[PDB]
Amino acid sequence: DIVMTQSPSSLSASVGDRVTITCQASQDIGNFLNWCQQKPGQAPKVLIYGASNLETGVPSRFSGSGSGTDFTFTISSLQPEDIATYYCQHYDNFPPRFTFGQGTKLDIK
Amino acid sequence: ITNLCPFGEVFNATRFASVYAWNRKRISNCVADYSVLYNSASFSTFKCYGVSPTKLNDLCFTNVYADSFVIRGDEVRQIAPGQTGKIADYNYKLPDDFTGCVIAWNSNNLDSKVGGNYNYLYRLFRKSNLKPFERDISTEIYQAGSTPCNGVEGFNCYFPLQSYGFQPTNGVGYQPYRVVVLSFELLHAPATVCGPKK
Amino acid sequence: EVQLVQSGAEVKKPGASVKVSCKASGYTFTSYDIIWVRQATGQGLEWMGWMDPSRGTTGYAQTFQGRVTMTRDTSISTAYLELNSLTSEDTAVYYCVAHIVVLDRWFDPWGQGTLVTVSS
Ligand SMILES: *[C@@H]1O[C@H](CO[C@@H]2O[C@@H](C)[C@@H](O)[C@@H](O)[C@@H]2O)[C@@H](O[C@@H]2O[C@H](CO)[C@@H](O[C@@H]3O[C@H](CO[C@H]4O[C@H](CO)[C@@H](O)[C@H](O)[C@@H]4O)[C@@H](O)[C@H](O[C@H]4O[C@H](CO)[C@@H](O)[C@H](O)[C@@H]4O)[C@@H]3O)[C@H](O)[C@H]2NC(C)=O)[C@H](O)[C@H]1NC(C)=O
Question: How the protein is affected by changing residue 122 to F (chain B)?
Fold first, then answer.
């Protein structure tokens, strides 16, 4: 059973700073990872697909790197609209099994 | 006549049939638009035969066929006229004077499974070669000479279908690929599919 | 363009059955798989199941296998999720989401969700 671990659980950073969130896979999943965001109340919106490619229409600030077991989600410059929770999302193909991490909230000081 | 052909349906299908069961679709009575297909950069391979990729929009086709299935990556060039090999000889063979286009794009994100795919089958050890454009779905045990079998497996009595081991961590060589090779009749009959024009 | 309009919030007594709808538009409904995910108050997303709108084949997580039934109606292009024997811990927001296949890519348009309240 694939188990993901997203850290840190929570963090704060002033606007415009570079923020990084790590996400470790219990078992190797190649690059079947996506990064999703949850603004308060709104439904999840997938931000990064493939762990490297940015979803169409997203600002270029967001980025994703890593592979194999560990992945990194990076915001180059924080902005007020970035307040939201952020989730890892590993997916399998034939049984469309979705597995999510514990999430992480961004709060500007 | 004015319609949008179901190229999206065949290309944007969730599940493609196995190579031994290569799915076939017939498209006619529509106005196709190959410009979108040609200009897309996602396709890893777009080699065409008999018709240059540029001027497809300028041709009226009697009737078009779309053959879709999956392939174990590296040996994608194996699908071509003349070219021989395992799957070409046993699963899917094109005629030497074939006219049409061959498409292929990496689909690791769409086919491979974390533990193992074990759901795409290709035939091995067929009695004889395979003629161009013919289906083969029989699942009879193959006798590799010597004594015959009766619904039994064993020495020289292998199963004819073998499954792939697609996984995310397999290397580009051993990653799934989807091929939707097309076919144009060019029979000079009353045209049914033609490109956009006034 | 793609919309996943969903039914409004509902309140049901414990042990009842809830039938949540999911309206989809802007794409061929009976061509791509649809899945469901519940987020419980104070907990992360949890994946419910999957339902092919064409063949009707379905699959569920083992944690609650047998407690749900996701039907469909291709005529109106709406998916349905039926959850029977509701309980207090079942109070969660359910997000119907299609699994669209762009060329060698999964595109996931989610719905606004539906908050289901189990109480007396
Ligand atoms: C497989 O599906 C792909 C995704 O298509 C979407 O999802 C499916 C399920 C349907 O709901 C479909 O309606 C959705 O669009 C599909 O890729 C899509 O292909 C269409 C064309 O067939 C593209 O539309 C054309 O886009 C270009 C450029 O678009 C840019 O801007 C938009 C603005 O939102 C961005 O979102 C894009 O990413 C691009 O940056 C337009 O120039 C073009 O306009 C011309 O055509 C229209 C008619 O469509 C005319 O009215 C105009 O006058 C122009 O002549 C189109 O609007 C669409 O962008 C594209 N989506 C993506 C994400 O790439 C793919 O084609 C399907 N498979 C195959 C084999 O086609």
Answer: Decreased HLA binding to NF9 epitope. Increased binding affinity to human ACE2
